Write an enzyme that holds these catalytic residues in place. Structure first.
Site, PDB file in Angstrom:
ATOM      1  N   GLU A   1       6.776   5.044   1.939  1.00 27.89           N
ATOM      2  CA  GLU A   1       5.591   4.848   2.763  1.00 27.89           C
ATOM      3  C   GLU A   1       5.608   5.720   3.998  1.00 27.89           C
ATOM      4  O   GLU A   1       4.582   6.306   4.357  1.00 27.89           O
ATOM      5  CB  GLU A   1       5.387   3.368   3.166  1.00 27.89           C
ATOM      6  CG  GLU A   1       5.267   2.429   1.997  1.00 27.89           C
ATOM      7  CD  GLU A   1       4.275   2.691   0.977  1.00 27.89           C
ATOM      8  OE1 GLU A   1       3.393   3.537   1.115  1.00 27.89           O
ATOM      9  OE2 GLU A   1       4.494   2.098  -0.123  1.00 27.89           O
TER      10      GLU A   1
ATOM     11  N   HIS B   1      -1.060   7.349  -8.690  1.00 23.38           N
ATOM     12  CA  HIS B   1       0.232   6.710  -8.968  1.00 23.38           C
ATOM     13  C   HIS B   1       0.688   6.906 -10.411  1.00 23.38           C
ATOM     14  O   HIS B   1       1.835   6.519 -10.728  1.00 23.38           O
ATOM     15  CB  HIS B   1       0.139   5.209  -8.655  1.00 23.38           C
ATOM     16  CG  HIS B   1      -0.194   4.886  -7.246  1.00 23.38           C
ATOM     17  ND1 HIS B   1      -1.480   4.684  -6.828  1.00 23.38           N
ATOM     18  CD2 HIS B   1       0.608   4.728  -6.174  1.00 23.38           C
ATOM     19  CE1 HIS B   1      -1.444   4.381  -5.529  1.00 23.38           C
ATOM     20  NE2 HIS B   1      -0.210   4.407  -5.114  1.00 23.38           N
TER      21      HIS B   1
HETATM   22  C1  LIG Z   1       6.513   0.345  -4.636  1.00 22.01           C
HETATM   23  C2  LIG Z   1       5.003   0.307  -4.549  1.00 22.01           C
HETATM   24  C3  LIG Z   1       4.586  -0.978  -3.856  1.00 22.01           C
HETATM   25  C4  LIG Z   1       4.464   1.562  -3.864  1.00 22.01           C
HETATM   26  C5  LIG Z   1       2.928   1.706  -3.874  1.00 22.01           C
HETATM   27  C6  LIG Z   1       2.526   3.016  -3.127  1.00 22.01           C
HETATM   28  O1  LIG Z   1       2.491   4.116  -3.695  1.00 22.01           O
HETATM   29  N1  LIG Z   1       2.300   2.890  -1.825  1.00 22.01           N
HETATM   30  O2  LIG Z   1       2.022   4.039  -1.083  1.00 22.01           O
HETATM   31  C7  LIG Z   1       2.344   1.759  -5.279  1.00 22.01           C
HETATM   32  O3  LIG Z   1       2.920   2.375  -6.182  1.00 22.01           O
HETATM   33  N2  LIG Z   1       1.123   1.190  -5.431  1.00 22.01           N
HETATM   34  C8  LIG Z   1       0.213   1.297  -6.499  1.00 22.01           C
HETATM   35  C9  LIG Z   1       0.583   1.591  -7.808  1.00 22.01           C
HETATM   36  C10 LIG Z   1      -0.374   1.629  -8.804  1.00 22.01           C
HETATM   37  C11 LIG Z   1      -1.713   1.472  -8.517  1.00 22.01           C
HETATM   38  C12 LIG Z   1      -2.751   1.616  -9.603  1.00 22.01           C
HETATM   39  N3  LIG Z   1      -3.455   0.357  -9.827  1.00 22.01           N
HETATM   40  C13 LIG Z   1      -2.969  -0.821 -10.253  1.00 22.01           C
HETATM   41  C14 LIG Z   1      -4.037  -1.672 -10.231  1.00 22.01           C
HETATM   42  C15 LIG Z   1      -4.123  -3.124 -10.577  1.00 22.01           C
HETATM   43  N4  LIG Z   1      -3.626  -4.028  -9.542  1.00 22.01           N
HETATM   44  S1  LIG Z   1      -4.470  -4.325  -8.151  1.00 22.01           S
HETATM   45  O4  LIG Z   1      -4.204  -5.685  -7.789  1.00 22.01           O
HETATM   46  O5  LIG Z   1      -5.821  -3.914  -8.387  1.00 22.01           O
HETATM   47  C16 LIG Z   1      -3.793  -3.264  -6.893  1.00 22.01           C
HETATM   48  C17 LIG Z   1      -2.411  -3.677  -6.384  1.00 22.01           C
HETATM   49  C18 LIG Z   1      -1.550  -2.447  -6.123  1.00 22.01           C
HETATM   50  C19 LIG Z   1      -2.533  -4.545  -5.144  1.00 22.01           C
HETATM   51  N5  LIG Z   1      -5.120  -0.976  -9.798  1.00 22.01           N
HETATM   52  N6  LIG Z   1      -4.767   0.264  -9.556  1.00 22.01           N
HETATM   53  C20 LIG Z   1      -2.083   1.204  -7.212  1.00 22.01           C
HETATM   54  C21 LIG Z   1      -1.131   1.111  -6.215  1.00 22.01           C
HETATM   55 ZN   LIG Z   2       2.478   5.727  -2.172  1.00 25.33          ZN
END
Ligand SMILES: CC(C)C[C@@H](C(=O)NO)C(=O)Nc1ccc(Cn2cc(CNS(=O)(=O)CC(C)C)nn2)cc1
Ligand SMILES: [Zn+2]
Length: 330
Positions: A167, A252
């Site tokens: 981050e 991602h």
């Molecule tokens: C170690 C990690 C925490 C790092 C973090 C990051 O890179 N930070 O900088 C990361 O990898 N995040 C992340 C990964 C995948 C997606 C794609 N994706 C998934 C969904 C469904 N789930 S959701 O509830 O909608 C969204 C969630 C994420 C709340 N939608 N899109 C979005 C965010």
């Molecule tokens: Zn990130």
């Protein structure tokens, strides 16, 4: 008001718990004697306890700290026992204060640069917002600070060295190359942050997992890690080569290209993680542009490697393995 030291715990039920003051260094905190209160802040890093809310005044987490029967050292936490337990982690707030220390020191010790700087040129304090939201299974950079959820059923609290390094390094990228957070550049932006996660681990303990998030995935979730840098496609969504990229693929998942590239380069004969990260850091600082394509980014790595005196045929082999074209890089 005065510097002080904090003793307490970190880790979680999966990777194990450990002690700041025994296994790891004592935490650097501050104390105001006029109110007998300590604060999870030092010059370089401030931890904010969001209290499961989505907004905060960003005052540092503060706790009573008093002398007890035998700078001064105090136990952390609102109960002065070293703990701040949440969702299977011992103290996300202690882990974040320590995470910020390590990432700041990596960029300084390996590169002689600040992790974050203000627009006016001076060092920028790392602000770590912990316990964000209710069941928030994510962490992110927002342009000025780092925010970490406490997880839910699939993840422990998202505060580890690797996640912290990831981050903070979004800010490093924003303040250098400025890779924009969409398209191919956005995949490179995400990748650089995954590379920095690995670097932080290697810098701290001399070993890295080649994975993102294994230390925060709950065992009952069925996922060993969130991402895999040896073979990104193991997560079912990320891509292994640039030829599988398409417009609209999330950053991602398109991060697989540069994640795989970094793994391949660091594992070439005569290479290692540090040399590979030296190339990426230099490219981020001096060559990559905000709308970089994957190919243009490979040309920036070649120029960085030339500056560093590293072998350009090893870079080219690695780019070729991820199907990046460099025929125009002159
Ligand atoms: C170690 C990690 C925490 C790092 C973090 C990051 O890179 N930070 O900088 C990361 O990898 N995040 C992340 C990964 C995948 C997606 C794609 N994706 C998934 C969904 C469904 N789930 S959701 O509830 O909608 C969204 C969630 C994420 C709340 N939608 N899109 C979005 C965010
Ligand atoms: Zn990130």
């Amino acid at each position: 008001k005065v510097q002080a030291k904090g003793m307490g715990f970190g880790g979680n039920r999966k990777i194990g718990e450990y002690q700041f003051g025994k296994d790891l260094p004592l935490l650097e905190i501050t104390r105001d004697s006029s109110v007998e209160m300590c604060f999870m802040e030092n010059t370089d890093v401030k931890v904010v306890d969001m209290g499961h809310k989505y907004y905060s005044n960003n005052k540092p987490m503060q706790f009573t700290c008093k002398e007890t029967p035998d700078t001064k050292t105090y136990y952390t936490g609102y109960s002065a026992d070293g703990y701040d337990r949440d969702n299977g982690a011992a103290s996300p707030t202690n882990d974040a204060l320590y995470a910020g220390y390590v990432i700041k020191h990596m960029y300084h010790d390996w590169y002689g640069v600040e992790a974050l700087t203000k627009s006016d040129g001076s060092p920028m304090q790392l602000v770590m917002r912990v316990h964000y939201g209710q069941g928030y299974e994510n962490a992110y950079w927002d342009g000025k600070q780092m925010t970490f959820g406490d997880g839910d059923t699939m993840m422990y609290p998202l505060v580890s060295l690797g996640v912290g390094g990831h981050e903070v390094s979004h800010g490093f990228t924003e303040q250098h190359s400025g890779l924009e957070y969409f398209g191919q550049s956005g995949g490179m932006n995400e990748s650089f942050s995954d590379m920095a996660a690995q670097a932080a681990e290697y810098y701290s303990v001399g070993k890295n997992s080649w994975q993102i998030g294994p230390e925060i995935m709950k065992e009952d979730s069925g996922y060993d890690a969130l991402r895999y840098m040896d073979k990104p496609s193991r997560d079912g969504m990320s891509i292994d080569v640039a030829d599988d990229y398409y417009g609209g693929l999330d950053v991602h998942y398109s991060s697989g290209v540069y994640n795989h590239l970094f793994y391949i380069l660091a594992n070439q004969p005569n290479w290692n993680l540090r040399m590979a990260f030296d190339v990426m850091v230099k490219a981020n600082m001096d060559y990559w542009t905000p709308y970089s394509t994957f190919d243009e980014g490979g040309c920036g790595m070649l120029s960085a490697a030339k500056d560093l005196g590293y072998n350009l045929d090893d870079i080219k082999k690695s780019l070729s393995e991820v199907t990046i074209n460099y025929q125009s890089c002159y």
